[PDB]
Every structure is written in C-alpha cells, then in structure tokens.
Amino acid sequence: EIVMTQSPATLSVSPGERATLSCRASQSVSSNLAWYQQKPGQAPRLLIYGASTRATGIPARFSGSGSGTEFTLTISSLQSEDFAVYYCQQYNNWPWTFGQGTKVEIKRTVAAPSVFIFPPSDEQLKSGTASVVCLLNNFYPREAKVQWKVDNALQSGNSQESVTEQDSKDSTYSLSSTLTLSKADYEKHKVYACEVTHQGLSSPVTKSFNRG
Amino acid sequence: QVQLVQSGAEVKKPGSSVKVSCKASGLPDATYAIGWVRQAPGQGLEWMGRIIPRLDAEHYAQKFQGRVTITADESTSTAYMELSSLRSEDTAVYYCARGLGYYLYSSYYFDIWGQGTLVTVSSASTKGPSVFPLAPSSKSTSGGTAALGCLVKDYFPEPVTVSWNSGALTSGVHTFPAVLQSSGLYSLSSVVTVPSSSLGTQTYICNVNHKPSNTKVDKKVEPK
Amino acid sequence: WRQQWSGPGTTKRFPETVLARCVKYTEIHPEMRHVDCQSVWDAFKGAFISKHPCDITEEDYQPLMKLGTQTVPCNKILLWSRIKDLAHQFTQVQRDMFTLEDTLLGYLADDLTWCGEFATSKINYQSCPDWRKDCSNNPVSVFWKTVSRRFAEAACDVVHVMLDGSRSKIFDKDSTFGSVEVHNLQPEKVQTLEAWVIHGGREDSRDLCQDPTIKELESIISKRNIQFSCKNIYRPDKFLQCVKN
Ligand SMILES: [Cl-]
Ligand SMILES: [Cl-]
Ligand SMILES: [K+]
Ligand SMILES: [K+]
Numbered sequence: 001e002i003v004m005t006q007s008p009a010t011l012s013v014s015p016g017e018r019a020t021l022s023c024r025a026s027q028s029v030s031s032n033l034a035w036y037q038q039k040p041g042q043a044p045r046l047l048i049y050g051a052s053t054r055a056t057g058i059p060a061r062f063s064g065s066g067s068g069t070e071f072t073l074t075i076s077s078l079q080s081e082d083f084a085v086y087y088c089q090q091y092n093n094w095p096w097t098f099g100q101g102t103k104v105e106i107k108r109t110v111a112a113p114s115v116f117i118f119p120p121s122d123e124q125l126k127s128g129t130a131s132v133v134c135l136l137n138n139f140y141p142r143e144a145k146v147q148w149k150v151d152n153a154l155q156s157g158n159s160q161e162s163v164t165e166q167d168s169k170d171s172t173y174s175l176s177s178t179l180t181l182s183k184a185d186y187e188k189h190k191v192y193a194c195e196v197t198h199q200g201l202s203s204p205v206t207k208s209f210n211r212g
Numbered sequence: 213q214v215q216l217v218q219s220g221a222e223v224k225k226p227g228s229s230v231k232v233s234c235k236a237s238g239l240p241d242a243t244y245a246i247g248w249v250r251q252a253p254g255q256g257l258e259w260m261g262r263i264i265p266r267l268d269a270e271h272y273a274q275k276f277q278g279r280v281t282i283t284a285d286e287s288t289s290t291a292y293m294e295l296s297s298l299r300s301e302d303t304a305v306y307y308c309a310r311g312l313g314y315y316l317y318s319s320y321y322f323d324i325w326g327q328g329t330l331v332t333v334s335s336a337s338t339k340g341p342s343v344f345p346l347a348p349s350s351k352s353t354s355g356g357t358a359a360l361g362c363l364v365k366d367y368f369p370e371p372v373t374v375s376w377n378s379g380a381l382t383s384g385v386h387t388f389p390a391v392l393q394s395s396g397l398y399s400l401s402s403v404v405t406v407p408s409s410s411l412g413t414q415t416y417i418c419n420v421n422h423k424p425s426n427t428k429v430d431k432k433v434e435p436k
Numbered sequence: 437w438r439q440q441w442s443g444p445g446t447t448k449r450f451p452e453t454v455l456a457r458c459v460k461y462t463e464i465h466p467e468m469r470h471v472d473c474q475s476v477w478d479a480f481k482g483a484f485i486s487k488h489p490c491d492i493t494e495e496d497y498q499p500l501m502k503l504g505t506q507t508v509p510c511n512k513i514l515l516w517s518r519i520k521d522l523a524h525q526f527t528q529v530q531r532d533m534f535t536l537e538d539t540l541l542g543y544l545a546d547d548l549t550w551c552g553e554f555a556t557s558k559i560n561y562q563s564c565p566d567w568r569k570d571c572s573n574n575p576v577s578v579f580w581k582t583v584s585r586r587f588a589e590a591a592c593d594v595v596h597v598m599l600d601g602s603r604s605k606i607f608d609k610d611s612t613f614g615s616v617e618v619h620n621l622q623p624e625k626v627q628t629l630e631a632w633v634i635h636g637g638r639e640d641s642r643d644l645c646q647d648p649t650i651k652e653l654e655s656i657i658s659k660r661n662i663q664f665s666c667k668n669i670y671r672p673d674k675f676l677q678c679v680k681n
C-alpha cells in the first residue's frame with residue numbers, strides 16, 4: 001500500500017496567516033487525493049476531493065492543489081475555529097491509506113489563568129476517599145505549574161493533572177489537578193491549598209480552604 | 213440529510229469478536245456505499261473495507277481480511293461490521309461513512325461519518341463511574357462568575373460522556389481528558405463557569421453516561 | 437427436450453456477481469474508473485438475452501467490447517493453456533504482468549456460465565449449451581473468443597505463454613490458445629513468443645521443449661515470421677518464490 005507522509009508534524013500560526021500543509025505519496029496517486037479536518041472528539045470532515053475540488057458547504061478559505069506525489073492544503077484567512085488535525089487520503093490504489101496527520105495550533109496573546117478550588121464531596125467522604133480539585137481556567141500558553149500544599153507542606157506524588165485541548169473560540173487551555181487522599185489522611189490536616197505559577201501571573205496565585 | 217448512527221462503546225476480551233452497527237437514514241437512493249475506518253493512536257486512520265447493500269458486495273483491505281466481515285440489512289438501512297480475534301492493537305475508534313464518487317456505488321472519499329465507536333480490547337472487567345459534585349463556593353468565584361462541575365471517578369473502560377442540563381448548557385463547559393489512576397481505573401472532570409448572581413435561581417445537573425457499563429447518572433450540583 | 441442443454445445453467449446470482457466484480461475492479465484499477473458498471477451489465481445482458489443460445493455472434497458482444505476497452509502494457513502480457521491457476525498466481529505476485537482475466541472483461545466473466553432463452557427475456561438457470569456436446573456458438577464460448585481475439589491482437593514485443601507439461605499433449609491446436617490466441621498474434625507488433633513448460637511434482641527430469649507439440653507450435657509461430665523461445669520450469673513453487681524475491 002502507498003504511504004502518505006504529511007509535513008510538518010505540528011504547525012503554529014496566528015489567525016489571519018496562511019497555513020500550508022504538505023502531503024507526500026510514496027508512489028503517484030494521480031489526482032485521487034482527499035483532505036480531511038478532524039476537530040477534537042469528532043469524526044473527520046471532508047474538505048477537498050480530487051486534489052483541488054471543495055466539498056459542499058466548505059469555505060473558499062480551504063484550497064487544495066497538486067498532483068502525483070506532492071499535494072498541498074492552503075488555509076487562507078485562518079481562524080481560531082481552524083484548530084484541528086488535518087489528514088490526507090489517497091484513493092488511487094487499494095487499499096486506501098491516510099497520512100499520519102498535521103495538527104494546526106493557534107497562536108494568541110498571553111492570558112493568566114483564573115484559579116478555582118473545590119473541597120471533597122460529603123458523599124465521597126462517606127466512601128473513604130477525599131479528592132481536592134484545583135482548576136486553572138482559560139489561559140495561554142500551555143505551560144502552567146501547580147503545587148499542592150497541605151498546612152503549607154508541599155505535597156508530592158498523590159495528584160494527577162489533565163490539560164484540555166485548545167479552545168475553538170478563545171484559543172486558551174484549561175487544567176485540572178486533583179489531590180486524592182484517604183479520609184484518615186484528610187482528617188489529619190486542616191489547611192489545603194494549591195499554588196499556581198504562570199507567565200501571565202506577576203506572582204503565584206493561591207486558592208485555599210480549611211475543613212469547616 | 214443523511215445521518216449515520218453507530219452503536220455504543222463497549223469492552224471486549226482478547227480473542228473475542230465485536231459487532232458494530234451503523235443505522236443510515238435519509239438516503240436518496242437504494243444504491244449506496246458504507247465504508248469503514250478505524251482510528252487508533254500510533255497506527256492512525258486505517259481503511260478496513262466497504263459494502264454495497266443492494267449488490268451485497270464487500271471489498272476488504274488485506275491487513276484485516278479474514279477477521280473483518282461487513283454485512284448489511286437493506287430494509288432497516290443498517291450496516292454491520294464484525295471483527296474477530298481481537299488483540300490489544302484493535303483498541304480503537306471504529307467509524308463508518310457514506311462512500312462518495314462519480315457513481316452511487318463508489319466509496320473513495322467520505323463526507324458524512326458516524327459518531328464513532330470506541331472498542332476496548334481488555335481482559336479487565338468493566339466498572340461503572342462514581343459521580344461526585346464539584347459544588348460552587350466562596351473559593352470558586354472569580355469576580356462575579358462562579359465555577360462548578362462534576363467528578364466521575366473509578367471507571368473502566370473509556371469513554372465517559374458528560375452533558376449539562378440535558379444539553380441545554382454548553383457555554384463555559386470544559387470536559388478534561390481522563391487520567392489513568394494507579395488502580396488502572398480512569399478519572400474525569402467536567403466544569404462550567406456560570407454567573408455568581410444566578411446560583412439561587414438556576415439549576416445545574418451534569419449528565420454522566422458510561423455505555424460500557426450501561427451507567428447513566430444525573431447529579432445536581434448545589435452551591436455551598 | 438426443447439432447449440434442454442448438457443452444460444451447467446447460468447451461475448446463481450450472475451447479475452449481482454458481474455456488477456460486484458465491476459465495482460471491485462474499478463476500485464483496484466484507477467484507469468478503468470470511467471466505466472459505468474450499470475452500463476457494462478446492460479451491454480453484457482443485451483448480448484445473449486432474448487437470443488438463441490446456439491446462434492451468438494461477435495457483434496452481440498461488440499457493445500460490451502466498447503464499454504470495456506482497456507490499454508494494458510502490451511509487452512507485459514502472459515498467455516496460458518490449461519494453467520489458469522498458476523498463471524494468475526504469477527501475475528498476482530509479479531503485478532506488472534497481465535493475463536486475460538486481469539482485464540475488466542476477463543475479470544467479470546472468469547469461472548462464470550451464462551445463457552438466455554430465445555422467446556423470453558429471462559436468464560436460463562437450468563442449463564446452458566456445452567461447447568462440444570451441444571453448440572459451439574454459445575454465449576460463454578463466443579464471449580471468450582471475442583475477448584481473446586482483441587487481447588491477442590493487442591500484444592507486442594515478447595509475449596509469454598504458460599503451458600502444462602503433464603497434461604498429455606502439452607500444446608493443443610484445438611484449444612482456445614492454439615486456435616484463437618496464436619492466430620491473432622500480429623507479427624507487426626509481436627516479436628517473440630517464449631513458452632514456459634511447467635512440470636508436475638519432480639516427475640519428468642527430461643526436457644519438454646523437444647516435445648513434438650512444441651515443435652509444431654514452433655513451426656506455427658515460425659510461419660508467422662515470429663521468434664519462438666522455450667524454457668523449462670522444473671520447480672513451479674520455487675519459480676513463484678523466485679519472482680517474489
Ligand atoms: Cl468553517
Ligand atoms: Cl467472486
Ligand atoms: K453463428
Ligand atoms: K485453453
């Protein structure tokens with residue numbers, strides 16, 4: 001089968017600039033080449049088919065071209081909603097093969113995170129576990145530090161982070177750190193806090209609470 | 213007009229077989245083509261095969277051929293794909309899509325896709341989630357806007373879908389990718405920012421759904 | 437007893453099969469995607485339907501010949517006689533070589549039987565005319581004669597033929613190869629005809645190129661002003677694995 005090789009791996013552009021995605025076929029595939037757009041948690045969306053021909057209800061922004069072993073997708077007036085992974089697909093040779101993908105990332109201005117904290121649920125405490133949730137909401141760039149402190153004592157190895165994909169509108173990220181302890185360990189300590197460092201912040205931000 | 217609706221996600225044991233449905237609706241003509249694509253991390257998008265329900269014609273990729281058999285019920289407009297001898301590498305999201313081309317039997321490119329079905333191949337038993345409210349308080353207010361959410365914890369396998377107020381609330385929502393806990397179970401958060409003033413009047417219910425365990429849970433997030 | 441035939445009837449689900457193959461073939465071969473598979477079936481059906489099974493002509497298949505016109509590389513053609521399976525295995529391994537059945541029309545009708553009644557416009561699934569016992573000019577026979585003529589004419593440079601050493605007389609003039617294919621090899625385009633004689637299971641250690649039927653074939657081809665090579669394939673299994681790598 002034919003090996004579709006796209007480039008670059010990732011691409012970082014600001015809204016208004018022209019993103020240029022490449023696609024190389026190991027062997028000639030004539031003009032039997034389709035382009036797709038996969039947004040997070042969705043099925044692929046057909047942009048182009050037959051190398052250059054757009055599909056129904058696809059903006060004129062998206063522009064396919066090239067033939068043989070070299071194809072291109074051109075997104076003219078790029079928008080924040082154009083955050084997606086873009087794939088190509090040959091259909092000249094059976095079986096059909098897709099490229100590995102080209103993720104387009106959106107560049108925006110720096111934005112400090114809004115920090116929120118949530119104590120453990122009373123339902124959860126009767127179970128036995130106690131989860132404390134920190135929330136960094138809508139920030140950029142992705143690089144964000146979180147530190148759990150219990151009575152001002154820096155915790156280590158009892159929490160898990162998870163960052164969201166890039167927002168379609170804001171172009172921002174969110175994070176969710178979760179300190180998980182037993183009730184036995186939770187009832188021992190009083191003050192729970194999470195310190196948050198980020199570019200946008202002039203100094204670390206701390207949300208905290210007591211049991212009460 | 214055309215819409216493909218696939219069956220839900222589920223867990224399967226290594227060596228067992230899976231059968232994913234795909235109910236088409238609003239098809240213009242009797243001669244159509246239903247392609248099948250799966251998406252796995254590492255491998256990526258892999259072509260599997262097609263079917264032409266009227267002709268009862270199937271064409272498979274060499275890689276899957278032997279394990280894959282695509283059938284179809286022409287009356288209900290439902291295509292089926294059965295994959296047997298499941299390995300860990302077959303853990304993927306299986307899509308279907310309407311085949312396009314110059315003719316109506318063509319399936320080269322695809323415009324309308326299904327929702328996708330995450331088949332997980334694991335010997336570990338399925339586990340339903342435990343939903344906990346992230347109640348809004350003094351601590352989760354950022355200048356006139358309150359934040360609240362839910363914590364779905366100790367579940368296996370993926371996925372777990374979360375909606376708010378039965379899909380009526382979407383603005384402000386952030387559903388985080390699940391983390392793999394030390395126990396092998398997954399944990400997920402879903403939060404939303406709402407006006408701080410309207411915490412008394414408005415109601416906020418998160419709708420958790422775990423199809424692998426047939427676990428649907430609704431939890432009202434009351435303020436504190 | 438009226439329209440009672442000896443050969444087997446039309447293949448079950450013959451219409452569905454032909455279409456399914458036509459769709460599948462166009463997917464594999466991108467140069468033949470212009471072909472409408474419904475039109476092909478129409479031209480196929482119209483050839484033998486509502487016509488007597490023993491009185492078929494080449495003009496019946498003329499419209500199908502137009503729909504299924506194909507330009508394969510003429511220097512990379514492989515003929516065969518009573519070695520369909522191995523010849524296909526060869527072309528399946530080495531993909532640049534083509535047999536008759538690797539073309540559209542050949543692919544469609546390979547291992548299929550078909551005929552229709554005169555009065556009605558319905559396909560005959562009960563029986564069809566045997567070439568030898570019943571009728572020479574039957575839909576299947578007349579089809580294969582027409583396509584093998586066009587295919588043999590199209591060939592050029594060095595054409596190949598894969599023969600069977602074990603099956604009695606190796607070359608057979610009364611076969612489709614001996615009668616049709618050989619006589620339509622135009623010497624303007626065709627330069628040489630190399631013969632590949634396949635042996636059994638290490639039975640014959642002798643040379644089968646001195647077989648008098650090959651010497652006949654040589655004489656036939658020589659009188660057309662065409663070269664005749666001939667080779668022995670002592671190990672078929674290793675030969676297939678050889679061309680692989
Ligand atoms: Cl758009
Ligand atoms: Cl078949
Ligand atoms: K005649
Ligand atoms: K023959």
